Paper text:
To gain insight into the architecture of trypanosomatid CBC, we generated a cryo-EM structure of the TbCBC tetramer. Since an affinity assay indicated the ability of the tetramer and dimer to interact with the m7GMP of the RNA 5’-cap, we included the commercially available m7GpppA in our cryo-EM grid preparations. The cryo-EM reconstruction extended to a resolution of 2.4 Å but accounted for only 48% of the residues in the complex. Although most of TbCBP20, TbCBP110, and an N-terminal portion of TbCBP30 could be modeled into the coulomb density, the C-terminal domain of TbCBP20, large parts of TbCBP30, and the entire TbCBP66 were absent. The radius of gyration of 6.15 ± 0.28 nm indicated the presence of the intact tetrameric complex, but the Kratky plot suggested disorder and/or flexible portions of the complex. The reconstructed and modeled portions of the tetrameric complex comprise mainly the large, exclusively α-helical TbCBP110 subunit. At a concave surface of TbCBP110, the smaller TbCBP20 subunit is bound. The N-terminal domain and the central RNA recognition motif (RNP) of TbCBP20 are well-ordered, but the C-terminal domain of TbCBP20 is not resolved indicating its flexibility. The m7GMP portion of the cap-analog is coordinated by TbCBP20. An N-terminal peptide of TbCBP30 (residues R33-I82) is bound in the cleft formed between TbCBP20 and TbCBP110 and the protein continues by forming a large loop across the adjacent surface of TbCBP110.
Author numbering:
A (entry chain 2): 1 to 128, 170 to 179
B (entry chain 3): 33 to 82
C (entry chain 1): 31 to 63, 87 to 127, 139 to 167, 177 to 193, 212 to 225, 240 to 350, 362 to 449, 454 to 499, ...
């Protein structure tokens, strides 16, 4: 299957101001341009993770889908502590496909998570108690 | 503000607690005597489901 | 449709797009109580097991009036991301052929699928056995259902083939596989048939997961057991939504009873038929195990499957009851590869696997007071410089603290590393200095520098955050590759440090005693043992940076005094550290990307390195801990240990188709589950990286990566034979004799 539910195609519903700031139409520009990026994306937004959930807990859950190339934790800018979400960049899109399918709405740390498809992370996106004092504030 | 105080378990869990209760009720499963003796609020606290 | 921001509904399909729709759906038809009817309409004739909200677009599609599909059947494509069985592919092919000719059905598809395999209900049982084979012996027995129940046996025997085929075909999409399993279960044939269907589905999913993880190589990096656990949880959740319109609680009860039956069979070591002897009324289906559990299946359940399920259910289980009845099963009294483990061991393994997904407070709150001994056993935990590399690694730590992993650079790290080592007295002695070739001296000094670098890395990171560990390994990967360039697959000393009344080589003695150079025991202890056996270069002899660092940090893993029946004989601190090390520093760095944000990997960690690090960690603590002159004391220790082990081996040999529990065991791999997990995951990671590299556009760097990965695979098989896992005793036969793990690797079909 996955040949029958085409929802397997990576689609990201919301729109964001950096995409808004780029002067493109929300049709055939930001939405169409992102599809080529998302159609090759290996990255997922996790969502609803607790503030006290550690990277080991997120790794332990998402590593059963595939190798995690990079795991970026959301961080409140003022305190550099996890702010509720995360970004799990896998090695292959098979892992990201498994994470969105299998791990969406799945209990991670006594919190039901909202694994979705993202285009790719950047230090800017990582922002929005383990004090990540090693990450340069920005 | 303990980490367990901020744990609210999913509404599906009432099915699993009921399933555990039903599994123990038949096949003759009995808790440990000391565990049963935890009638002074010494038994395992259970997280609240919504 | 694909590559689109909006989903388009189904349209008229060409006969190509039909063969595929049929290949991935036609098999499911014979399993329900007419051709030309769409799956939603065919389910209406089965009592509409699934509500309209859960039905999918594909179930809406009706059959076309094409006679081209009739003639193009006279080889079908391959489903993505799964290792399809020869029976499953044959069954789906004959399903399409017999659905076209459709334009007793199940019994003829299974009989006709079997003939295809074995040319050029026992049938519905041999079908499941053929599905789970590279023959599989069924873990859970269907014949134990009651009196006058040939119909119920067939209903479950078909739910097992249906669940197997449904995870083989619908598995990547969990929601769709769960809706197809609910549809099969919730047929309205009879209320007593629902329990049999649920039992068949749960047992089939579990057995398929465990057989897939043993003999199926698909190179996807997705754990079959976690997927099975999430699928069974999704089944329960989806039966909950059907119920809010038999019961979600009942399916959950079979899932638990099937897990508890497996646990009790592991603890009892024999088919005690615990639920059969505890039946409430007899009419109810009670899961029984048809045989004991192989070590691989026990590792699957206690390390992946049950911990994942428990995480899904908030770590809540019938904990006190299970521990009590497992303890009763302990005081009791077969299959060659079957295993018995004590309750303490079983629940210790289960809770250490579970504790990685949570924290100590949650397990403390959940677990009753009867688990206090278990909790204390599963809960100095930090990595500390081993007083070797201490004064050299302090400078590196001061640099790392000052800059941080974000600011750490390879060249500045190299400068600080040389500035710190060269000062140290041992480096001055080695540099200044019966004969030492310049090649040996640069080898011994580069080895010390790399060991200092890795020890400083492990101490600074504490191996607690995978992001920091991965970023630091990525930054320092050129430095590590440059430092291990001279070392490579070569022994640090020119000649073996054991000669001949067997003694150590004079330059080796000089290094250990006068210069205070520390060689990890795996470099010389096996050769010493083999000399001592003779009295009455090896792959592990070749240098491994991670073996040295593991020995320095005291990562000693061993078995239990109770024998094989235990296994978790190791301190909690050392076991937690060896997980955080054999999983972050080795497994997650094997074939890992050169940069953050695939197919471009740095060779800091090799497969042979992981295997030899496990073997070093599994050396006896008597032979691994340094004494308190030192060299001869160590050698005498080795000699007396070898005499004792030879006596034990000869006793076992005269004590003896033959059960593996009755053969000589070193309690190294058959005892520690971290060893087996790491050894399997090495090959799994290599195959996954192979798939990613091949998927990348063809070129030259991809070709180099592919050759590197096949070299890693070949080196992995050779290093395992070096240990004895793939075969008067030999030193490897006395240090790492692991008949259960050896039997698994010799019959897994992956080496
Ligand atoms: C809700 N979000 C938030 N989010 C990302 O999270 C980052 C931080 O969002 P907040 O500032 O709301 O925490 C943003 O840069 C945004 O791209 C998301 N990214 C993806 N792909 N999908 C989603 O549903 C969401």
């Amino acid at each position: 299957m996955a040949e029958y539910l085409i929802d397997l195609t990576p689609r990201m519903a919301y729109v964001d101001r950096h995409e808004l700031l780029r002067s493109l139409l929300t049709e055939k520009e930001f939405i169409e341009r992102r599809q080529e990026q998302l159609n090759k994306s290996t990255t997922v937004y996790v969502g609803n993770l607790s503030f006290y959930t550690t990277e080991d807990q997120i790794w332990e859950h998402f590593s059963r889908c595939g190798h995690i190339r990079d795991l970026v934790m959301g961080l409140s800018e003022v305190t550099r502590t996890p702010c509720g979400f995360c970004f799990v960049v896998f090695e292959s899109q098979d892992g990201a496909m498994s994470a969105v399918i299998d791990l969406h709405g799945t209990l991670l740390d006594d919190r039901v998570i909202t694994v979705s498809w993202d285009v790719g992370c950047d230090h800017t996106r990582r922002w929005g108690l383990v004090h990540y004092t090693w990450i340069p504030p920005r | 503000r303990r980490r367990e105080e901020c744990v609210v378990l999913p509404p599906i869990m009432t099915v699993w607690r009921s399933a555990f209760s039903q599994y123990t009720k038949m096949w003759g499963l009995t808790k440990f005597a000391g565990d049963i003796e935890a009638e002074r609020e010494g038994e395992g606290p259970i997280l609240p489901p919504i | 449709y694909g590559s689109s921001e909006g989903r388009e509904l189904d349209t008229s399909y060409t006969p190509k797009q039909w063969l595929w729709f049929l290949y991935v759906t036609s098999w499911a038809r014979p399993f329900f109580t007419w051709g030309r009817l769409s799956f939603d309409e065919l389910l209406k004739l089965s009592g509409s097991p699934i509500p309209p909200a859960m039905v999918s677009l594909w179930m809406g599609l009706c059959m076309p009036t094409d006679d081209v599909v009739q003639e193009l059947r006279i080889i079908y494509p391959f489903l993505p991301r799964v290792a399809e069985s020869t029976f499953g592919r044959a069954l789906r092919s004959l399903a399409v052929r017999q659905h076209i000719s459709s334009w007793a059905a199940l019994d003829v598809l299974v009989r006709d699928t079997l003939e295809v395999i074995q040319n050029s209900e026992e049938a519905l049982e041999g079908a499941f056995r053929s599905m789970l084979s590279a023959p599989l012996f069924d873990v859970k027995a269907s014949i134990p259902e009651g009196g006058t129940a040939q119909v119920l046996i067939r209903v479950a025997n078909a739910a097992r083939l249906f669940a197997a085929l449904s995870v083989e075909a619908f598995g990547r999409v969990k929601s769709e596989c769960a809706v197809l399993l609910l549809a099969h279960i919730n047929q309205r044939d009879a209320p007593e048939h629902v329990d049999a269907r649920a039992y068949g589905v749960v047992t089939g999913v579990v057995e398929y997961a465990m057989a897939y993880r043993y003999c199926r190589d698909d190179g996807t990096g997705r754990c079959p057991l976690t997927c099975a656990a999430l699928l069974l949880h999704r089944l329960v959740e989806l039966q909950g939504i059907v119920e809010k319109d038999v019961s979600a609680s009942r399916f959950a009860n079979m899932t638990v009873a099937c897990i508890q039956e497996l646990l009790f069979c592991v603890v009892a070591g024999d088919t005690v038929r615990w639920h059969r002897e505890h039946q409430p009324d007899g009419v109810s289906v009670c899961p029984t195990a048809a045989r004991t559990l192989t070590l691989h299946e026990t590792d699957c359940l206690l390390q992946v499957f049950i911990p994942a399920l428990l995480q899904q259910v908030g770590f809540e289980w019938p904990w006190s009851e299970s521990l009590r009845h497992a303890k009763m099963l302990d005081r009791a009294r077969v299959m060659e590869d079957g295993v018995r483990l004590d309750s303490r061991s079983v629940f210790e393994e289960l809770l250490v696997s579970v504790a990685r997904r949570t924290y100590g407070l949650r397990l403390r709150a959940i677990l009753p007071q009867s688990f206090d001994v278990i909790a204390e056993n599963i809960f100095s935990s930090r990595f500390a410089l081993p007083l070797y590399y201490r004064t050299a690694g302090e400078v590196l730590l001061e640099y790392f603290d000052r800059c941080g992993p974000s600011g750490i650079t390879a060249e500045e790290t190299e400068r600080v590393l040389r500035r710190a080592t060269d000062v140290q007295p041992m480096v001055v002695q080695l540099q200044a200095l019966v004969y030492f070739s310049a090649r040996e001296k640069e080898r011994l000094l580069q080895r010390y520098r790399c060991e200092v670098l890795l020890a400083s890395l492990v101490v600074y990171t504490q191996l607690r955050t995978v992001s920091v560990v991965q970023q630091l390994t990525r930054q320092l990967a050129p430095l590590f590759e440059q430092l291990l360039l001279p070392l490579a697959h070569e022994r640090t000393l020119s000649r073996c440090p054991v000669i001949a009344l067997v003694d150590l080589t004079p330059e080796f003695k000089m290094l250990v005693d006068e210069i205070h150079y520390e060689f990890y025991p795996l470099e010389w202890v096996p050769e010493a043992v083999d000399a001592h056996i003779r009295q009455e270069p090896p792959c592990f002899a070749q240098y491994s940076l991670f073996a040295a660092i593991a020995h320095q940090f005291g990562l000693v893993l061993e078995g239990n005094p109770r024998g094989f029946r235990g296994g978790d004989g190791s301190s909690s601190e050392v076991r937690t550290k060896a997980y955080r090390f054999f999983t972050l520093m080795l497994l997650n760095n094997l074939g890992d990307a050169v940069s953050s944000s695939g197919a471009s990997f740095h060779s800091v960690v090799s497969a042979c390195d992981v295997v030899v690090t496990m073997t070093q960690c599994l050396l006896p603590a008597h032979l691994s801990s340094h004494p308190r002159s030192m060299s001869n004391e160590w050698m005498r220790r080795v000699g007396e240990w070898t005499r004792s082990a030879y006596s034990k081996y000869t006793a076992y040999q005269q004590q003896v188709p033959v059960p593996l529990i009755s053969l000589y065991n070193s309690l190294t791999f058959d005892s520690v589950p971290l060893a087996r997990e790491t050894i399997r995951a090495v090959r799994s990671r290599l195959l996954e990286k192979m798939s990613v590299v091949t998927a990348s556009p063809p070129g030259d760097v991809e070709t180099a990566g592919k050759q590197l990965l096949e070299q890693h695979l070949s080196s992995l098989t050779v290093t395992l034979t070096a240990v004895g896992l793939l075969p008067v005793p030999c030193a490897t036969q006395l240090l790492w004799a692991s008949p259960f793990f050896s039997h698994e690797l010799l019959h897994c079909g992956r080496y």
